[PDB]
Amino acid sequence: EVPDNPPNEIYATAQQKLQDGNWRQAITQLEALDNRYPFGPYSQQVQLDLIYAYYKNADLPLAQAAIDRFIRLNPTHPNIDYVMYMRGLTNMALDDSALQGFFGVDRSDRDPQHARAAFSDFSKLVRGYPNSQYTTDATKRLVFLKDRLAKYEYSVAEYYTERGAWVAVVNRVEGMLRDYPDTQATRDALPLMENAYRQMQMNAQAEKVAKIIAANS
Amino acid sequence: DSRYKRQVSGDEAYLEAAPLAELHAPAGMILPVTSGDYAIPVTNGSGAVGKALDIRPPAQPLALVSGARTQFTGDTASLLVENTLWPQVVSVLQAKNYTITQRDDAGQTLTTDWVQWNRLDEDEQYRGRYQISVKPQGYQQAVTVKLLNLEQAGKPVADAASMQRYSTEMMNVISAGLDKSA
Ligand SMILES: [K+]
Protein backbone atom coordinates (compact mmCIF):
# COMPACT_ATOMS: atom_id res chain seq x y z
CA GLU A 1 0.00 0.00 0.00
CA VAL A 2 1.88 2.99 -1.36
CA PRO A 3 1.44 6.24 0.66
CA ASP A 4 -0.26 9.37 -0.63
CA ASN A 5 2.69 11.55 -1.74
CA PRO A 6 2.89 13.79 -4.87
CA PRO A 7 3.40 12.00 -8.27
CA ASN A 8 6.97 13.30 -8.64
CA GLU A 9 8.18 12.12 -5.23
CA ILE A 10 6.74 8.69 -6.07
CA TYR A 11 8.54 8.59 -9.39
CA ALA A 12 11.74 9.62 -7.64
CA THR A 13 11.20 6.76 -5.23
CA ALA A 14 10.33 4.43 -8.03
CA GLN A 15 13.49 5.35 -9.89
CA GLN A 16 15.69 4.52 -6.85
CA LYS A 17 14.07 1.17 -6.24
CA LEU A 18 14.52 0.55 -9.97
CA GLN A 19 18.21 1.36 -10.03
CA ASP A 20 18.46 -0.70 -6.84
CA GLY A 21 17.49 -3.78 -8.84
CA ASN A 22 14.61 -3.98 -6.38
CA TRP A 23 11.83 -4.93 -8.78
CA ARG A 24 8.76 -5.71 -6.65
CA GLN A 25 9.03 -2.37 -4.88
CA ALA A 26 9.45 -0.44 -8.11
CA ILE A 27 6.41 -2.26 -9.53
CA THR A 28 4.30 -1.32 -6.48
CA GLN A 29 5.33 2.34 -6.83
CA LEU A 30 4.94 2.51 -10.57
CA GLU A 31 1.67 0.73 -10.49
CA ALA A 32 0.18 3.12 -7.95
CA LEU A 33 1.42 6.09 -9.96
CA ASP A 34 -0.01 4.64 -13.25
CA ASN A 35 -3.44 3.99 -11.58
CA ARG A 36 -3.72 7.30 -9.70
CA TYR A 37 -2.46 9.57 -12.50
CA PRO A 38 -3.30 7.88 -15.80
CA PHE A 39 -3.32 11.30 -17.47
CA GLY A 40 0.08 11.95 -15.88
CA PRO A 41 2.51 14.27 -17.68
CA TYR A 42 5.13 11.46 -17.88
CA SER A 43 2.90 8.37 -17.95
CA GLN A 44 4.71 6.67 -20.82
CA GLN A 45 8.05 6.54 -19.01
CA VAL A 46 6.10 4.95 -16.20
CA GLN A 47 4.72 2.35 -18.53
CA LEU A 48 8.19 1.67 -19.96
CA ASP A 49 9.77 1.31 -16.51
CA LEU A 50 7.02 -1.18 -15.59
CA ILE A 51 7.51 -3.27 -18.70
CA TYR A 52 11.20 -3.23 -17.88
CA ALA A 53 10.64 -4.12 -14.19
CA TYR A 54 8.15 -6.92 -14.84
CA TYR A 55 10.68 -8.47 -17.25
CA LYS A 56 13.51 -8.31 -14.71
CA ASN A 57 11.22 -9.48 -11.95
CA ALA A 58 9.96 -12.32 -14.22
CA ASP A 59 6.28 -11.23 -14.22
CA LEU A 60 6.23 -12.02 -17.87
CA PRO A 61 2.45 -12.18 -18.52
CA LEU A 62 2.24 -8.88 -16.65
CA ALA A 63 5.01 -7.38 -18.71
CA GLN A 64 3.06 -8.51 -21.74
CA ALA A 65 -0.10 -6.73 -20.56
CA ALA A 66 1.73 -3.42 -20.09
CA ILE A 67 3.39 -3.88 -23.46
CA ASP A 68 0.07 -4.46 -25.16
CA ARG A 69 -1.65 -1.47 -23.63
CA PHE A 70 1.29 0.74 -24.51
CA ILE A 71 1.38 -0.27 -28.18
CA ARG A 72 -2.24 0.47 -28.58
CA LEU A 73 -2.21 3.86 -27.02
CA ASN A 74 1.04 4.99 -28.45
CA PRO A 75 1.24 3.48 -31.97
CA THR A 76 3.69 6.14 -33.26
CA HIS A 77 5.93 6.43 -30.14
CA PRO A 78 9.74 6.78 -30.85
CA ASN A 79 10.30 3.82 -28.52
CA ILE A 80 7.58 1.51 -29.83
CA ASP A 81 10.41 -0.66 -31.05
CA TYR A 82 11.85 -1.28 -27.60
CA VAL A 83 8.43 -2.34 -26.39
CA MET A 84 8.26 -4.85 -29.24
CA TYR A 85 11.70 -6.12 -28.53
CA MET A 86 10.76 -6.45 -24.90
CA ARG A 87 7.70 -8.40 -25.88
CA GLY A 88 9.89 -11.00 -27.63
CA LEU A 89 12.26 -11.26 -24.65
CA THR A 90 9.21 -11.97 -22.51
CA ASN A 91 8.05 -15.08 -24.42
CA MET A 92 11.64 -16.18 -24.87
CA ALA A 93 12.08 -16.23 -21.10
CA LEU A 94 8.79 -18.13 -20.66
CA ASP A 95 10.24 -20.66 -23.06
CA ASP A 96 13.63 -21.02 -21.31
CA SER A 97 11.84 -21.66 -18.02
CA ALA A 98 9.46 -24.22 -19.52
CA LEU A 99 12.42 -26.29 -20.75
CA GLN A 100 14.22 -25.74 -17.49
CA GLY A 101 11.31 -26.99 -15.35
CA PHE A 102 11.33 -30.25 -17.29
CA PHE A 103 15.07 -30.88 -17.30
CA GLY A 104 15.91 -34.54 -17.34
CA VAL A 105 12.24 -35.30 -17.76
CA ASP A 106 10.86 -33.83 -20.93
CA ARG A 107 9.24 -34.91 -24.14
CA SER A 108 10.77 -34.04 -27.46
CA ASP A 109 7.25 -33.21 -28.70
CA ARG A 110 6.38 -30.79 -25.96
CA ASP A 111 5.05 -27.87 -27.98
CA PRO A 112 7.42 -24.93 -27.60
CA GLN A 113 4.48 -22.55 -27.82
CA HIS A 114 6.23 -19.61 -26.17
CA ALA A 115 9.02 -19.88 -28.69
CA ARG A 116 6.47 -19.57 -31.50
CA ALA A 117 5.06 -16.48 -29.75
CA ALA A 118 8.53 -14.99 -29.41
CA PHE A 119 9.13 -15.67 -33.12
CA SER A 120 5.91 -13.93 -33.92
CA ASP A 121 6.93 -10.86 -31.85
CA PHE A 122 10.47 -10.45 -33.19
CA SER A 123 9.41 -10.67 -36.87
CA LYS A 124 7.09 -7.71 -36.35
CA LEU A 125 10.03 -5.79 -34.92
CA VAL A 126 12.54 -6.64 -37.63
CA ARG A 127 10.03 -6.13 -40.48
CA GLY A 128 8.57 -2.95 -39.03
CA TYR A 129 11.81 -1.40 -37.79
CA PRO A 130 14.89 -2.73 -39.67
CA ASN A 131 17.01 0.14 -38.37
CA SER A 132 16.08 -0.38 -34.76
CA GLN A 133 18.88 -0.70 -32.31
CA TYR A 134 17.36 -4.09 -31.30
CA THR A 135 17.03 -5.60 -34.76
CA THR A 136 20.41 -7.27 -34.95
CA ASP A 137 19.90 -9.18 -31.74
CA ALA A 138 16.25 -9.98 -32.48
CA THR A 139 17.35 -11.43 -35.78
CA LYS A 140 19.95 -13.60 -34.02
CA ARG A 141 17.15 -14.93 -31.87
CA LEU A 142 14.72 -15.53 -34.76
CA VAL A 143 17.40 -17.78 -36.25
CA PHE A 144 17.81 -19.67 -33.02
CA LEU A 145 14.02 -19.94 -32.58
CA LYS A 146 13.28 -21.07 -36.11
CA ASP A 147 15.66 -23.91 -35.53
CA ARG A 148 13.94 -24.85 -32.24
CA LEU A 149 10.52 -24.72 -33.92
CA ALA A 150 11.44 -26.99 -36.85
CA LYS A 151 13.15 -29.34 -34.43
CA TYR A 152 9.74 -29.73 -32.82
CA GLU A 153 8.23 -30.67 -36.11
CA TYR A 154 10.97 -33.27 -36.47
CA SER A 155 10.15 -34.80 -33.09
CA VAL A 156 6.53 -35.23 -34.02
CA ALA A 157 7.39 -36.76 -37.39
CA GLU A 158 9.78 -39.12 -35.59
CA TYR A 159 7.10 -40.18 -33.07
CA TYR A 160 4.63 -41.03 -35.88
CA THR A 161 7.36 -42.84 -37.77
CA GLU A 162 8.08 -44.97 -34.70
CA ARG A 163 4.39 -46.03 -35.01
CA GLY A 164 3.93 -46.57 -38.69
CA ALA A 165 1.56 -43.66 -39.00
CA TRP A 166 2.83 -42.97 -42.49
CA VAL A 167 0.32 -40.27 -43.50
CA ALA A 168 0.86 -38.29 -40.29
CA VAL A 169 4.55 -38.40 -41.29
CA VAL A 170 4.33 -37.06 -44.85
CA ASN A 171 1.82 -34.45 -43.73
CA ARG A 172 4.18 -33.31 -41.02
CA VAL A 173 7.35 -33.17 -43.01
CA GLU A 174 5.53 -31.53 -45.88
CA GLY A 175 4.67 -28.86 -43.31
CA MET A 176 8.36 -28.52 -42.45
CA LEU A 177 9.11 -28.11 -46.13
CA ARG A 178 6.52 -25.41 -46.52
CA ASP A 179 7.49 -23.55 -43.33
CA TYR A 180 11.12 -24.26 -42.38
CA PRO A 181 12.84 -25.52 -45.55
CA ASP A 182 16.04 -23.79 -44.52
CA THR A 183 16.51 -25.45 -41.13
CA GLN A 184 18.70 -28.37 -40.08
CA ALA A 185 15.73 -30.30 -38.68
CA THR A 186 14.05 -30.24 -42.06
CA ARG A 187 17.13 -31.84 -43.59
CA ASP A 188 17.08 -34.53 -40.91
CA ALA A 189 13.34 -35.14 -41.51
CA LEU A 190 13.52 -35.89 -45.24
CA PRO A 191 14.80 -39.46 -44.55
CA LEU A 192 11.66 -39.95 -42.43
CA MET A 193 9.56 -38.69 -45.31
CA GLU A 194 11.27 -41.05 -47.77
CA ASN A 195 10.78 -43.93 -45.47
CA ALA A 196 7.06 -43.28 -45.03
CA TYR A 197 6.57 -43.18 -48.78
CA ARG A 198 8.53 -46.38 -49.43
CA GLN A 199 6.33 -47.90 -46.70
CA MET A 200 3.17 -46.71 -48.37
CA GLN A 201 4.58 -48.16 -51.63
CA MET A 202 4.77 -44.78 -53.34
CA ASN A 203 8.07 -45.00 -55.12
CA ALA A 204 7.87 -42.05 -57.54
CA GLN A 205 7.29 -39.80 -54.56
CA ALA A 206 9.87 -41.57 -52.43
CA GLU A 207 12.52 -41.15 -55.14
CA LYS A 208 11.83 -37.42 -55.49
CA VAL A 209 12.51 -37.11 -51.77
CA ALA A 210 15.76 -39.03 -52.31
CA LYS A 211 16.71 -36.77 -55.18
CA ILE A 212 16.36 -33.89 -52.73
CA ILE A 213 18.24 -35.50 -49.85
CA ALA A 214 21.17 -36.12 -52.19
CA ALA A 215 21.21 -32.63 -53.67
CA ASN A 216 21.77 -31.34 -50.13
CA SER A 217 24.49 -33.78 -48.95
CA ASP B 1 27.80 -5.88 -9.48
CA SER B 2 24.92 -4.45 -11.53
CA ARG B 3 25.40 -5.98 -15.00
CA TYR B 4 22.28 -8.16 -14.43
CA LYS B 5 20.27 -4.92 -14.32
CA ARG B 6 21.23 -3.80 -17.83
CA GLN B 7 21.08 -7.22 -19.45
CA VAL B 8 18.68 -9.65 -21.10
CA SER B 9 17.87 -12.82 -19.15
CA GLY B 10 19.06 -16.32 -20.02
CA ASP B 11 22.40 -16.99 -21.69
CA GLU B 12 24.15 -16.21 -24.95
CA ALA B 13 23.83 -19.74 -26.48
CA TYR B 14 21.45 -18.52 -29.23
CA LEU B 15 24.38 -16.70 -30.85
CA GLU B 16 25.87 -20.18 -31.43
CA ALA B 17 22.87 -21.33 -33.51
CA ALA B 18 23.94 -22.47 -36.98
CA PRO B 19 23.12 -20.29 -40.02
CA LEU B 20 20.07 -21.29 -42.12
CA ALA B 21 20.51 -22.28 -45.70
CA GLU B 22 18.14 -22.32 -48.64
CA LEU B 23 17.40 -25.82 -49.83
CA HIS B 24 19.17 -26.82 -53.08
CA ALA B 25 16.84 -28.04 -55.81
CA PRO B 26 17.75 -31.18 -57.79
CA ALA B 27 17.69 -31.02 -61.59
CA GLY B 28 14.13 -31.41 -62.94
CA MET B 29 12.75 -29.71 -59.79
CA ILE B 30 12.16 -26.10 -58.75
CA LEU B 31 11.89 -25.08 -55.07
CA PRO B 32 10.42 -21.92 -53.49
CA VAL B 33 12.82 -19.62 -51.68
CA THR B 34 11.90 -19.30 -47.98
CA SER B 35 8.77 -17.16 -47.69
CA GLY B 36 5.82 -16.11 -45.57
CA ASP B 37 5.77 -16.54 -41.82
CA TYR B 38 9.08 -17.84 -40.52
CA ALA B 39 10.95 -16.11 -43.29
CA ILE B 40 13.68 -13.94 -41.76
CA PRO B 41 14.70 -10.80 -43.61
CA VAL B 42 18.41 -10.23 -44.22
CA THR B 43 19.94 -7.42 -42.15
CA ASN B 44 23.68 -7.63 -41.56
CA GLY B 45 23.29 -5.00 -38.85
CA SER B 46 24.77 -4.05 -36.70
CA GLY B 47 23.87 -3.21 -33.11
CA ALA B 48 24.90 -4.94 -29.91
CA VAL B 49 23.98 -8.57 -29.32
CA GLY B 50 23.51 -10.79 -26.27
CA LYS B 51 24.88 -9.47 -23.00
CA ALA B 52 26.36 -6.40 -24.62
CA LEU B 53 22.89 -5.07 -25.41
CA ASP B 54 21.49 -2.77 -22.76
CA ILE B 55 17.75 -3.39 -22.24
CA ARG B 56 16.96 -0.50 -19.88
CA PRO B 57 13.98 1.62 -21.00
CA PRO B 58 14.94 4.54 -23.25
CA ALA B 59 15.33 7.73 -21.21
CA GLN B 60 12.65 10.21 -22.24
CA PRO B 61 12.90 13.63 -20.59
CA LEU B 62 10.24 14.31 -17.93
CA ALA B 63 7.72 17.18 -17.86
CA LEU B 64 8.16 17.75 -14.13
CA VAL B 65 6.78 21.21 -14.81
CA SER B 66 3.03 21.86 -15.00
CA GLY B 67 1.74 22.42 -18.55
CA ALA B 68 5.11 21.81 -20.25
CA ARG B 69 5.97 19.64 -23.24
CA THR B 70 9.39 17.95 -23.62
CA GLN B 71 11.27 16.37 -26.54
CA PHE B 72 14.45 14.53 -27.43
CA THR B 73 16.19 14.48 -30.77
CA GLY B 74 19.77 13.24 -31.37
CA ASP B 75 21.99 14.60 -28.60
CA THR B 76 19.66 17.43 -27.56
CA ALA B 77 16.93 17.22 -24.97
CA SER B 78 14.63 20.22 -24.41
CA LEU B 79 11.67 21.50 -22.32
CA LEU B 80 8.95 23.97 -23.45
CA VAL B 81 7.99 25.90 -20.34
CA GLU B 82 4.84 28.03 -20.43
CA ASN B 83 10.76 34.93 -19.23
CA THR B 84 13.76 35.41 -16.87
CA LEU B 85 14.02 31.62 -16.72
CA TRP B 86 17.70 31.94 -17.52
CA PRO B 87 18.81 33.02 -14.01
CA GLN B 88 16.68 30.29 -12.50
CA VAL B 89 18.37 27.60 -14.63
CA VAL B 90 21.71 29.07 -13.77
CA SER B 91 20.94 28.71 -10.08
CA VAL B 92 19.83 25.09 -10.44
CA LEU B 93 23.08 24.29 -12.18
CA GLN B 94 25.08 26.21 -9.62
CA ALA B 95 23.10 24.47 -6.88
CA LYS B 96 24.15 21.07 -8.17
CA ASN B 97 27.73 22.29 -8.22
CA TYR B 98 28.31 21.95 -11.96
CA THR B 99 31.25 24.09 -12.98
CA ILE B 100 30.41 26.47 -15.80
CA THR B 101 33.38 27.04 -18.09
CA GLN B 102 31.96 29.79 -20.25
CA ARG B 103 28.80 31.81 -19.89
CA ASP B 104 27.00 34.15 -22.31
CA ASP B 105 24.42 35.90 -20.16
CA ALA B 106 23.14 38.00 -23.06
CA GLY B 107 22.94 34.92 -25.30
CA GLN B 108 21.37 32.94 -22.41
CA THR B 109 23.68 29.99 -23.04
CA LEU B 110 26.60 28.31 -21.24
CA THR B 111 28.94 25.31 -21.23
CA THR B 112 29.67 23.12 -18.32
CA ASP B 113 32.74 21.36 -17.25
CA TRP B 114 32.49 17.67 -16.97
CA VAL B 115 29.61 16.61 -14.86
CA GLN B 116 30.01 13.48 -12.72
CA TRP B 117 26.96 11.20 -12.67
CA ASN B 118 26.32 8.41 -10.19
CA ARG B 119 23.66 5.71 -10.57
CA LEU B 120 23.22 2.35 -8.84
CA ASP B 121 22.51 0.66 -12.16
CA GLU B 122 25.88 1.57 -13.66
CA ASP B 123 29.06 -0.30 -12.87
CA GLU B 124 31.37 2.27 -14.38
CA GLN B 125 29.97 5.75 -13.92
CA TYR B 126 29.47 8.32 -16.68
CA ARG B 127 30.68 11.93 -17.06
CA GLY B 128 29.14 14.41 -19.47
CA ARG B 129 29.87 17.83 -20.75
CA TYR B 130 26.88 20.04 -21.66
CA GLN B 131 25.82 23.14 -23.57
CA ILE B 132 22.74 24.50 -21.80
CA SER B 133 20.62 27.47 -22.89
CA VAL B 134 17.21 29.13 -22.83
CA LYS B 135 15.75 30.13 -26.21
CA PRO B 136 13.00 32.78 -26.31
CA GLN B 137 10.97 30.50 -28.52
CA GLY B 138 7.42 31.75 -28.22
CA TYR B 139 6.28 32.85 -25.91
CA GLN B 140 6.59 30.22 -24.63
CA GLN B 141 10.27 29.47 -23.79
CA ALA B 142 12.64 26.55 -24.41
CA VAL B 143 15.25 25.13 -22.08
CA THR B 144 17.56 22.88 -24.09
CA VAL B 145 20.32 20.49 -23.04
CA LYS B 146 23.01 19.42 -25.47
CA LEU B 147 25.37 16.57 -24.60
CA LEU B 148 28.63 17.63 -26.23
CA ASN B 149 30.83 14.75 -25.03
CA LEU B 150 30.22 11.68 -22.92
CA GLU B 151 32.81 9.63 -21.03
CA GLN B 152 32.89 6.37 -19.22
CA ALA B 153 35.91 4.97 -17.47
CA GLY B 154 37.76 7.75 -19.26
CA LYS B 155 36.85 6.52 -22.77
CA PRO B 156 34.64 8.54 -25.09
CA VAL B 157 31.25 7.07 -25.81
CA ALA B 158 28.93 8.04 -28.60
CA ASP B 159 26.29 5.34 -28.93
CA ALA B 160 22.74 6.57 -29.28
CA ALA B 161 21.36 4.80 -26.19
CA SER B 162 23.88 6.34 -23.81
CA MET B 163 23.79 9.79 -25.40
CA GLN B 164 20.02 9.80 -24.83
CA ARG B 165 20.20 8.53 -21.28
CA TYR B 166 22.63 11.20 -20.22
CA SER B 167 21.23 13.97 -22.22
CA THR B 168 17.99 13.10 -20.48
CA GLU B 169 19.60 13.04 -17.01
CA MET B 170 20.73 16.63 -17.20
CA MET B 171 17.36 17.73 -18.58
CA ASN B 172 15.74 16.05 -15.59
CA VAL B 173 17.97 17.62 -12.97
CA ILE B 174 17.00 20.95 -14.50
CA SER B 175 13.23 20.26 -14.61
CA ALA B 176 13.21 19.05 -10.99
CA GLY B 177 15.16 22.13 -9.91
CA LEU B 178 12.72 24.35 -11.80
CA ASP B 179 9.85 22.66 -10.07
CA LYS B 180 11.26 22.85 -6.49
CA SER B 181 10.75 26.64 -6.64
CA ALA B 182 8.16 27.66 -9.32
K1 LIG C 1 18.83 -18.88 -24.74
From Swiss-Prot, chain A:
Pfam families in the record: YfiO
InterPro entries linked to this entry: BamD, BamD-like, TPR-like_helical_dom_sf
GO CC annotations on file: Bam protein complex; cell outer membrane; membrane
Subunit structure: Part of the Bam complex, which is composed of the outer membrane protein BamA, and four lipoproteins BamB, BamC, BamD and BamE. Forms a subcomplex with BamC and BamE. Interacts directly with BamA. The Bam complex has the shape of a hat, with the BamA beta-barrel crown in the outer membrane and the periplasmic brim formed by the BamA POTRA domains and the 4 lipoproteins.
Organism: Escherichia coli (strain K12)
Biological process per Gene Ontology, one example term: protein insertion into membrane
UniProt subcellular location: Cell outer membrane
Keywords from the named record: Cell outer membrane, Lipoprotein, Membrane, Palmitate, Signal
Free-text function comment from the UniProt entry: Part of the outer membrane protein assembly complex (Bam), which is involved in assembly and insertion of beta-barrel proteins into the outer membrane. Constitutes, with BamA, the core component of the assembly machinery. Probably involved in transient protein interactions. Efficient substrate folding and insertion into the outer membrane requires all 5 subunits.
Lineage, opening ranks: Bacteria, Pseudomonadati, Pseudomonadota, Gammaproteobacteria, Enterobacterales
Family: Belongs to the BamD family.
Gene label: bamD
Membrane topology: Lipid-anchor
PROSITE patterns: PROKAR_LIPOPROTEIN (PS51257)
Protein name (database record): Outer membrane protein assembly factor BamD
Domain note: The N-terminal may interact with various proteins as a chaperone to assist in the folding and insertion of proteins into the outer membrane. The C-terminal region may serve as the link between BamA, BamC and BamE.
Disruption phenotype: Depletion decreases the density of outer membrane proteins, but does not significantly affect transport of lipopolysaccharides to the outer membrane.
From Swiss-Prot, chain B:
Domain notes for this protein: Contains two well-defined domains connected by a flexible linker. The C-terminal domain may serve as an important protein-binding surface for interaction with other Bam components or substrates. In addition, contains a long unstructured N-terminal region, which is required to stabilize the BamCD complex. Only the N-terminus of this protein is observed in the Bam complex in X-ray or EM structures, most of the protein must be highly mobile.
Protein name (record): Outer membrane protein assembly factor BamC
Role of this protein: Part of the outer membrane protein assembly complex (Bam), which is involved in assembly and insertion of beta-barrel proteins into the outer membrane. Nonessential member of the complex that stabilizes the interaction between the essential proteins BamA and BamD. Efficient substrate folding and insertion into the outer membrane requires all 5 subunits.
GO molecular function: identical protein binding
Keywords: Cell outer membrane, Lipoprotein, Membrane, Palmitate, Signal
Membrane topology per record: Lipid-anchor
Part of the full-length chain shown: 28 to 213 of 344
Species of provenance: Escherichia coli (strain K12)
Main location: membrane
Family classification: Belongs to the BamC family.
Locations listed in the record: Cell outer membrane
The keyword Lipoprotein appears for this protein: yes
UniProt record, GO biological process: Gram-negative-bacterium-type cell outer membrane assembly; protein insertion into membrane
Assembly, per entry: Part of the Bam complex, which is composed of the outer membrane protein BamA, and four lipoproteins BamB, BamC, BamD and BamE. Forms a subcomplex with BamD and BamE. The Bam complex has the shape of a hat, with the BamA beta-barrel crown in the outer membrane and the periplasmic brim formed by the BamA POTRA domains and the 4 lipoproteins.
GO cellular component, one term: membrane
